[PDB]
């Protein structure tokens, strides 16, 4: 009726809150692994500093 359908229409927004946690759980980690793979520029800096040391 109306009372049972309004709890399923609130359940559509209940998955809008779980998608709001899904957008902050991966983006905190997919960018942090990009902040840990940035050491390849630092390994390039140690390799470039081994050229001027040579």
């Amino acid at each position: 009726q109306g009372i049972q359908q309004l709890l399923q229409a609130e359940k559509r927004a209940a998955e809008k809150v779980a998608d709001a946690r899904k957008r902050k759980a991966r983006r905190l980690k997919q960018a942090k692994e990009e902040a840990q793979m940035e050491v390849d520029q630092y390994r390039r800096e140690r390799e470039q500093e081994f050229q001027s040391k040579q």
Binding site: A13, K16, V17, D19, A20, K24
Partner: peptide
């Protein structure tokens, strides 16, 4: 319900 979804799914 969708007007709250414009704020409760975009501000966070």
């Amino acid at each position: 319900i969708e007007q709250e979804a414009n704020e409760k799914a975009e501000e966070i």
